[PDB]
Amino acid sequence: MRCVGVGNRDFVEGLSGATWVDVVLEHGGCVTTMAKNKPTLDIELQKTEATQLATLRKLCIEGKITNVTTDSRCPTQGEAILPEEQDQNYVCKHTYVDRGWGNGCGLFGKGSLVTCAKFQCLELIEGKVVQHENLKYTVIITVHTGDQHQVGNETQGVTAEITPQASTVEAILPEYGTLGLECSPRTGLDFNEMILLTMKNKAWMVHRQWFFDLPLPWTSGATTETPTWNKKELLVTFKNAHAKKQEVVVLGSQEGAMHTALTGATEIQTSGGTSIFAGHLKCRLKMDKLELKGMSYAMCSNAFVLKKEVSETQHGTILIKVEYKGEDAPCKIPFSTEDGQGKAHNGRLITANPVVTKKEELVNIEAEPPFGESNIIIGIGDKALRINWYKKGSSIGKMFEATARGARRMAILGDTAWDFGSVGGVLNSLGKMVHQIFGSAYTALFSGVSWIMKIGIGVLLTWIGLNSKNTSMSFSCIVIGIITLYLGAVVQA
């Protein structure tokens, strides 16, 4: 019940024969797994706490010059060296200057000149590699139990810690048994290639190769005062006043340009622990040992009253907040959905088994009524509650939105998107293999291509396919162009 109104939840209606169902968990999204008899529950990944980060490759985004010394010599006298040239904190460049009479020596021509200047870093930024051993995943498993304060609560739920070591934890539900989730945390974000650079109080996940590529002076990051910055010439510019002389400049603070540089990298919260809020991981969760509490409970004769007006979720599932008026502390809510001006059973119950735990508190029953007019009955007697409700929807529209959501998942997860609700069919395996090969070939080609360039390349490929006589090439170009249009229209997230 934790994942209700989340806006990115997507149901997992089908349980496998061996009772394990495979779900891919995203931070923003949600997964409400159902079953024929097991208690339904909405697993949702909280965060990925990363600890014991090892800083490396400190980068200077600012600088300072302090000393600047110059020494120039005459033409055909060789280069003009300085005693500070051998120092490891001075950056300097050779330049030729025209000299002659009235300037120091008789011979006329161009004489060498060197201006060496000490370098101090001032502000700096450090990329931290995430230690894969200490990477930790925390996932909540809230169960649809109809608690009064559970309808959209983010606090309620039993957490299960998952790490690359010991990645299978059997979360102990309060009275629903043990949900043994066997999750694969090595197929999530390839954290071996992401390093967490931090500017002041802000941190980001950036591709490690890109971090190594960005031009800024850098050092070993060994917490040593006054380090030596390799490639420190990037934050100093030497300019010639025509040809008379040489001047050094500190080139200001590159902090804003660094904010612009990481314009597509997702952001981490570094306050407290370096908690990463983006990402995903796959979970094969076993519902072997879940027990439906209230399976042995009896029905209840007394009437029901709903405290607050019935609302609708974004995914069309109704949600009822009803209080029992009886004297039966344990209970099983009767529940039948009657079609308009008739009798039938065409509406499902998204909450597995509604039970009154106490008369003092009230239960949050959630349901998925069928399309169009519907009548929902809570009580079992002649004085049963009647919740009339009408669902604005078209099953074709639901199919379209489901295909759209599946495409959104496929455009992000990629190879593993086929494992979102995999019951275990052999067709899913073949689809996953085909998708993996095609996606490897695709990301081999389109890696580093901006969204506008993806749109352009896709349009060009579609046009090529529409004007190609060879049918195989035409079809290939049409399909790749349409896929590229979709990706470039969704890629920049």
Epitope: E62, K64, L122, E123, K200, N201, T270, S271, G272
Partner: antibody
Framework: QVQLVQSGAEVKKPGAPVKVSCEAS????????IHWVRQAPGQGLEWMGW????????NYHPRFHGGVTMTRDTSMKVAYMELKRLTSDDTAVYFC???????????????WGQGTLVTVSS | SVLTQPPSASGTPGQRVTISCSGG????????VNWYQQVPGTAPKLLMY???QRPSGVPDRFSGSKSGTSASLAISGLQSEDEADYYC???????????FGGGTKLTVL
């Protein structure tokens, strides 16, 4: 020798602007901030804004933004400051301090002024 | 986040004085702490011109350090002159302003 000397103790009634000044001499004025700290009578110290006299940029405290203005006037090496509408509550002593440009020197203040005490009463 | 510190006191024999500022994860954790001494009626003096660094004088009676989100000023024995109002100042980044401590009236007893 480098030091900061204020304008001198001033008294005004509520709803009257006051222009507290801070003299700077002995060093390169443009290379250091003026952090214009405040201290109420028998109360905790409270920083309220610094200006960069090399450029004139002003970083007011969120509380004092708009209520106060600070001008560098680098010609005479005198970091002026003004209060737009002085109230009865804002009675205090306004020190002017010297700070370094970089991040490590944002919050370090040496060579404070004596502080122009401003009393507000009707 | 606002960094805080309590008022403390100690006897004239300098056993130990522990004067601590506990700031947030943006002000103290990433910026050097700076300690200020204010004898009442006088302008404050820069007790610490950096983290665990003294500008001039009073050695081993004023010695600080920060570990993580908190900073403190340690001692090897106080004297009668060490009675003043102390302030810890750090440059916050989220608020983007210089934060001063709430004050502390250390009295030689």
């Amino acid at each position: 020798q480098v030091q900061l000397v204020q304008s001198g103790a001033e008294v005004k009634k509520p709803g009257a602007p006051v222009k507290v000044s801070c003299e700077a001499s002995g060093y390169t004025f443009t290379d250091y901030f003026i952090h214009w700290v405040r201290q109420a009578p028998g109360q905790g110290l409270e920083w309220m804004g610094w200006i960069n006299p090399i450029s004139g940029g002003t970083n007011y405290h969120p509380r004092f933004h708009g209520g106060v203005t600070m001008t560098r006037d680098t010609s005479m090496k005198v970091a002026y400051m003004e209060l737009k509408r002085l109230t009865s509550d804002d009675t205090a002593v306004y020190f002017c301090a010297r700070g370094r440009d970089f991040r490590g020197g944002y919050s370090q203040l040496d060579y404070w002024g004596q502080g122009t005490l401003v009393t507000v009463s009707s | 986040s606002v960094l805080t510190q309590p008022p403390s006191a100690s006897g004239t024999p300098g056993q130990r004085v522990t004067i601590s500022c506990s700031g947030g994860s943006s002000n103290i954790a990433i910026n050097t702490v700076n300690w200020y001494q204010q004898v009442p009626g006088t302008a404050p003096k820069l007790l610490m011109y950096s983290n665990n660094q003294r500008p001039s004088g009073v050695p081993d009676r004023f010695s600080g350090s920060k570990s993580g989100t908190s900073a403190s000023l340690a001692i090897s024995g106080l004297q009668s002159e060490d009675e003043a109002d102390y302030y810890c100042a750090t440059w916050d980044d989220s608020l983007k302003d210089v934060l001063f401590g709430g004050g502390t009236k250390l009295t030689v007893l």
